[PDB]
């Protein structure tokens, strides 16, 4: 019933199989929502970002294809959410009368992501299909290429977990810090480096776009 998305460079072949993995087991939610734990800093977040927004997936894809640096391909992956997918709001409430503060600017950021987080692992059997995204510089527009169906997909009438993320880390030192973003105020957790990547070929590299502090950008569009 509740479906979500994630853009990735790895072939339908591979993630139908493997799914998506978090960097680690750190459940400091604020640290993940800042794109620190999941992307920019010590990559160890317990969470995998997904979005309910088709439009957002196209905005993510644009940030790679639009660079001559990016040699890969991209696919939009459609995923069925269930009792290990969580929306952030109930966890935020849970944290905020435990003294943890979320700034207005953080809440603006979160509100732009349409995000649902998954803990630790998203099995390949929750991934319905894959659509190859094609870039065209002719008019600089992203298009849907061929559509791949996961034969291994397991049907199901299941929705997002409406409660709080379990064993949430509640910090002793909550301060205001950089909000790592890219593109049009896209959280860094949505970038390729948001999940564990493949690393057996030690010579290989791939293109990540320009990241920035959202605090600066938000300061410039709010006043």
């Amino acid at each position: 019933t509740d479906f979500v998305y994630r853009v990735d460079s790895r072939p339908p072949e591979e993630i139908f199989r493997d799914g998506f993995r978090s960097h680690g087991f750190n459940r400091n939610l604020q640290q993940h929502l800042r794109g620190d734990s999941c992307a920019a800093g010590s990559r160890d977040s317990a969470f995998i970002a997904t979005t309910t927004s088709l439009i957002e997936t196209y905005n993510i894809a644009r940030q790679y294809y639009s660079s001559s640096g990016f040699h890969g391909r991209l696919y939009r992956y459609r995923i069925r959410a269930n009792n290990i997918f969580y929306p952030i709001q109930p966890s935020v409430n849970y944290l905020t009368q435990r003294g943890i503060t979320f700034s207005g600017f953080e809440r603006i950021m979160m509100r732009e992501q349409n995000e649902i987080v998954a803990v630790e692992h998203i099995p390949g059997e929750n991934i319905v299909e894959a659509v190859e995204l094609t870039y065209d510089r002719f008019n600089s527009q992203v298009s849907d290429g061929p559509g791949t169906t996961n034969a291994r997909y397991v049907p199901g009438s299941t929705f997002v977990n409406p409660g709080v993320i379990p064993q949430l880390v509640v910090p002793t030192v909550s301060v205001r810090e950089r909000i790592n973003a890219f593109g049009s105020l896209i959280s860094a957790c949505f970038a390729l480096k948001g999940v564990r990547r493949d690393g057996l070929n030690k010579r290989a590299t791939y293109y990540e776009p320009e990241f920035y502090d959202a605090r600066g950008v938000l300061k410039e569009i709010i006043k």
């Binding site: 088709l54 439009i55 732009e112 600089s140 527009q141 298009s143 593109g183 049009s184 105020l185 410039e220």
Partner: protein
């Protein structure tokens, strides 16, 4: 007024601002480029032009909103008019469309504003 022409559920994917002299006076302009993912549009460019010293026309307000929507990548509706400018390499670069109004889209089938 004429709010009959518009595009629904589009995003701003480009911005432009500049100063120029044409026809003998100094002017201001800003342009937006719009897209609809996976769909080609007949029109991709809207501008607002302001000769310095003219009457207030909401140039700043419109420019600030456009920047705002470009920053969020938000879904919006864009209203435009046909405006034959006549610095015209301006039209070769920025087309003959005047941006008139910007509205948000809360869902893929509702946008605020006249319809």
């Amino acid at each position: 007024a004429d709010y009959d022409k518009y595009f629904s559920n589009v995003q701003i994917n480009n911005l432009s601002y500049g100063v120029y002299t044409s026809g003998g006076k100094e002017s201001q302009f800003f342009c937006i480029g719009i897209k609809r993912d996976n769909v080609t549009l007949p029109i991709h460019n809207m501008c607002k032009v302001d000769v310095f010293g003219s009457h207030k026309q909401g140039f700043d307000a419109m420019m600030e909103m456009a920047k705002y929507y470009y920053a969020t990548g938000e879904s919006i509706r864009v209203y435009y008019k046909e405006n034959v400018w006549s610095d015209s390499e301006f039209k070769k670069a920025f087309s003959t469309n005047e941006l008139i109004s910007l509205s948000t889209c809360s869902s893929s089938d509702y946008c605020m504003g006249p319809q």
